[PDB]
Every structure is written in C-alpha cells, then in structure tokens.
Amino acid sequence: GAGTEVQDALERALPELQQALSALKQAGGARAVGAGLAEVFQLVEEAWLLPAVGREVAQGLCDAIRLDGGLDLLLRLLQAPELETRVQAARLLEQILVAENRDRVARIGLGVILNLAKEREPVELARSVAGILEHMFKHSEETCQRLVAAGGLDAVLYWCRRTDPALLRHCALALGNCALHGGQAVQRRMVEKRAAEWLFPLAFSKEDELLRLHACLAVAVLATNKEVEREVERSGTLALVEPLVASLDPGRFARCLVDASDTSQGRGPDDLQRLVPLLDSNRLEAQCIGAFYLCAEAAIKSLQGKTKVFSDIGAIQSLKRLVSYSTNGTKSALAKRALRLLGEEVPRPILPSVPSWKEAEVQTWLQQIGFSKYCESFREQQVDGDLLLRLTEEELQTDLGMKSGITRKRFFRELTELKTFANYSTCDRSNLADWLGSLDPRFRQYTYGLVSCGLDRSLLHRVSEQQLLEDCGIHLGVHRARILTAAREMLHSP
C-alpha cells in the first residue's frame, strides 16, 4: 500500500501539525515552548518509526516544514537565553536535515551552530549538535572549509574525549564524512591538527563494533592520500585495522545498517563512488575496509533488483583484479564472498612464477584481465611466459592485431602491473630485483629486461645509456638516468 499511501499518510499527519507548529509560535513562555517542541519531536519520531512507509512520509513532511517558514523559528530559538529550550530545539533540529533542507540551513543558519559550538558542558546539547555537524559536513566543499576554518573542528576533537555511547558515533561519522567529501586542503589541516592521533581512543574501545568500524573507515580514507600517509603511519593507529576486519562477519552487519540511520535501502550511487577509489590503492588496510563495506552493501542491495549499479560504478573489474593478485587471506576471502553474492563468476588466483608459463596459463590470464577477445591470436601464435615478458609494440600492431593505440596502452598498463608481481627466482642470480625495488617500487618491472640480457650487480658499473635503450628495453629517459646515476656510484660503496 506504499504506492497508495503517498497521498494517505500525508493526509493524516499535516492535518494536526499544520496548526500545532505555529499554535505556540509567538508565546514567550519559558515552559510553553517545550510542549509544542515535544509534540513535533514525537511526530518526527512517528514518521520514521513505522517500517516500509517512513521514507516518503518523512521526506515530504520535512519539505513541508521547510515550506511553512519554520526554520527561522528554530534559528531564533537556538539563541534564546534559557538552556532547556536550547537543548530541546537542538534535539528537534537534528531530525530534520535531509538533502533539501540542508541547503537552506547552509544558506542562512551556519553562524548560530558555530556560536553553539563554544558551549561544551551540557551533555544533551553536545549530543545533538554533534549530529548537526555530522549532517552538515556532507553538503559542500566550501561548507567544510568554513567549518574547519571557524573552529568547528576543535569542538569535534574535544568531544572525542568523553565517554558517551551515542556522542562518539556522531563524532566518528563527522570525522569520516569530513575526510570523505572534504578535499585536499581540509585533509592537510586535519592531519596537522593531530586528528589521526585522536582517532585511536575511538577505535580501541572494546564496547561496540560500530564505533570501531566508523573510526577505521575514517582513518583509511585519511590514509589513502599520499601526501600525509607518513604522519598517519607515525601515529600508529593503522595497525588496528586487520584484527578487527578479521574478527567480524559481513552477514551479521547485513540486517544491520537497515534500521539505524533512516531505514533505507543502503547508500546512494554518489555515496558508493566514494569507496571504489580506496579499493584501488597500494595499502592493505584501506583495501580490506573497502572490501568489507562493498560486501555489506552488496548483501543489502542484492535482495532487491538493483544489480546494475555495481557494474555502472566499476566495482566488478576492481574486485576481480583484487582476487587475482591476492597476497592476503582476509581481503581475498571478502572479495570472493562479495563476488559470490553477485552473478559474476569467481576468478582463480594465478601462479607468481611468470617465466616458465605455458599457453593455457596465458589464456586464463587474458580471461581474467578483460582482454578476452584476443585470446585467439595468442593461442594461434603460441605465446608463452617468456615471449610475453619481452613483447614490444610492433608485434602488437602487426600480427597480434591490436590496431588502436588505446588498446595497446591498456595492454601495456596491465602488463606492467603484472610484472611487478612476478617471481624471478629462476632467472635472477644476484637478486637484482631487490636492488631495483630499493630505488622505486615502479622500477621492478624492468628486472627481466636486465637479466635476460645478462647483467647483474657486478656488471652494472660500466654500462651506457644507449646500451639500455634497445638491449634492455627501458624507454623513459628519466628512468635510464636514475638507473645509471645510482649504479655508477655503486662500485663497492654500499
């Protein structure tokens, strides 16, 4: 009856509040305001209460409260001299900020909330204004810039000390949303204010797991950025991600996150594209947390018919690539479980000894990376591991049949991704891989190019720049220059 009650639920709620919201509007009574406040608070706790009807009855009701000219009443009563009217007005203002009302509050109200951020002592005040800041960090980048530049972050970082079991959830979600939709400057000014250190007492509390999940999510989003990962690793709170994820179940937190916030069918598409960029990064904790959240969301959204958003965003290719190069037990398990919840078939992990491959293994590789239409040409020319590791652009253009330059560039990108993963135990002699990887993680991709030519750690001190252009296959001049200047120093000095 949800498709019928879109007129019926609103024709039984607006009837009474439509007068009661202004029934006591001009009265300056101390104890008079509280009654109408409690009345409206009861109604907004009624709209959300009854399941499978509460989304539209809540959103249209909130829009009507916006259109009736009552936000200015709240913004007045937030500056009242009495304290209990302030706390009741704040607790009512917490329950109204939906995606449309938040624009008007960000337009007009933004200063009074910052004025309330100085009052720290009454707990019912802080419990609601923390949720107000939580909902207001999601609006825009300028709003985040203001709330970090007017002292609205110091409030959050001071309220992280207290021991309330409902204040800390709002505090964690505030820091997570701020780091998520903030930008670059706000991140730098967040890590400068030692926010990575203050997240540690929030993630180590062994009382509840939602607090630990939101704290780990916030620290992972902060640690995805490359500029300030050194500070975050020096803080020492990244070490507490693995045990937690390893000691949980996505299946039980599925059927959770369906009743807490707003009783909705998960997070939106534009919220879901905030997790995929942290799923592809050279960090392990980040990948694990991302896998966890995607698994949970997939669980919640696979009961319905929406099984196309995870293909529109591009999580399927990233999860399959995560499975194929799995060097860990936890994220591989979570990834396989999340792919099993969808109709996509599970890939198999591939052997890391890339030389001494045969045609079958090459075919399976080309079946997992996405170049599945060129498998025929490879099976025709009988390419193996050795002949794969020494491919050039000419053989792609001429007889393998990759005409377009963009396909060739995709192929080389995937290939160089694979060659930093391989095991050269049967070709290398003097462990040249390690000496290359010490300079730069991206420098391991050329090691077979050096070994098959015959160089080693005793014979590099007398090689030229031209001798690396066609014999070893290093094209970027900067890379050749760094290899030469780092080897020519090493005669026996390190």
Residues that bind other proteins (CB under 8 A): 106-107, 111, 114-115, 140-142, 161, 163, 183-184, 187, 194, 197-198, 200-201, 204-206, 224-227, 239-240, 243, 273, 276-277, 280-281, 312-314, 403-407, 409-410, 413, 440, 442, 476-479, 481-482
Closest CA to 324 of 357, 370, 384: 370
Output b/e per residue, 380-391; b: 16+ Cβ within 10 A: eeebebeebbee
If the CB atoms of residues 81 and 329 are measured against a copy of itself, the closer one turns out to be: 329
* Total residue count of the chain as it appears in this document: 494
> Which of 313, 305, 371 has its CA nearest to residue 342?
305
Of 135 and 301, which CB lies nearer to a copy of itself in the complex structure?
Answer: 135
Show the binding pattern over residues 287-326: x = contacts a copy of itself (CB under 8 A), - = does not: ----------------------------------------
Q: Does 327 bind a copy of itself (CB under 8 A)?
A: yes
Longest CA pairwise span in the chain (Å) = 92
Find the shortest distance in angstroms from Cβ 142 to a copy of itself.
6
φ/ψ of residue 254, rounded to 5: -70, 140
Nearer to other proteins, 187 or 287 (CB): 187
CB of 235 to a copy of itself, least distance (A): 26
1 forms part of the interface with a copy of itself (CB under 8 A): no
Contacted by 327, from other proteins, a copy of itself, none: CB < 5 to 8 Å by type: a copy of itself
Q: Contact letters (x/-) for a copy of itself, 130-169, by CB under 8 A?
A: ----------xxx---------------------------
- Give residue 454's identity as a one-letter amino acid code: G
**229 labeled part of a ligand binding site:** no
230 is in an annotated binding site: no
Tokens, residue 313: 């965003």
| 8 Å CB contact between 221 and 174 | no
* 57 Cβ contact list (under 8 Å, min separation 6): 5, 9, 10, 13, 47
Q: By CB under 8 A, tell whether 353 contacts a copy of itself.
A: no
Among other proteins, a copy of itself, none, partner that 206 touches (CB below 5 to 8 angstroms by kind): other proteins
371 annotated as belonging to a binding site for a ligand? no
CA distances to 129, 342, 485 from 92, in Å: 11, 41, 67
Give the residue, chosen from 264, 328, 377, 397, that forms a contact with a copy of itself under the rule CB under 8 A.
328
430 contributes a contact to a copy of itself by CB under 8 A: no
Q: Is 327 helix (H, G, I), strand (E, B) or coil?
A: coil
Q: How many residues contact a copy of itself, by CB under 8 A? A: 8
Least separation in angstroms between CB 464 and a copy of itself: 39
Question: Using a CB cutoff of 8 Å and minimum separation of 24, what contacts does 253-256 make?
Answer: 253/209, 253/213, 253/296, 254/296, 254/299, 254/300, 256/210
Please tell me whether 316 is known to bind a ligand. Answer: no
Contact 289, 220 (CB under 8 A): yes
Is residue 248 a contact point for a copy of itself (CB under 8 A)? no
- Closer Cβ to a copy of itself, 140 or 263, answer by number: 140
183 binds, among other proteins, a copy of itself, none (CB under 5 to 8 A by kind): other proteins
| CA pair distance 44, 41, nearest whole angstrom | 5
Distance CA 113, CA 127 (A): 13
Asked whether 199 and 215 are in contact (CB, 8 A), the reply is: yes
If contact means CB under 5 to 8 A according to the sort of partner, which of a copy of itself, other proteins, none does residue 328 touch? a copy of itself
Q: With 0-12 CB in 10 A as exposed, 13-18 as middle and 19+ as buried, what is 45? A: exposed
Flag whether 227 is marked binding.
no
Helix, strand, coil in percent for the chain, rounding step 5? 65, 0, 35
What are the tokens at 266? Answer: 């998960």
| Contacted entry of a copy of itself, other proteins, none for residue 282, CB cut-off 5 to 8 Å set by kind | none
The contact mask relative to a copy of itself for 105-124 (x = CB under 8 A, - = no) is -xx-----------------
What residue numbers does the annotated binding site for NAD(+) cover?
48, 55, 94-102, 135-138
* Known binding residues: 48, 55, 94-102, 135-138
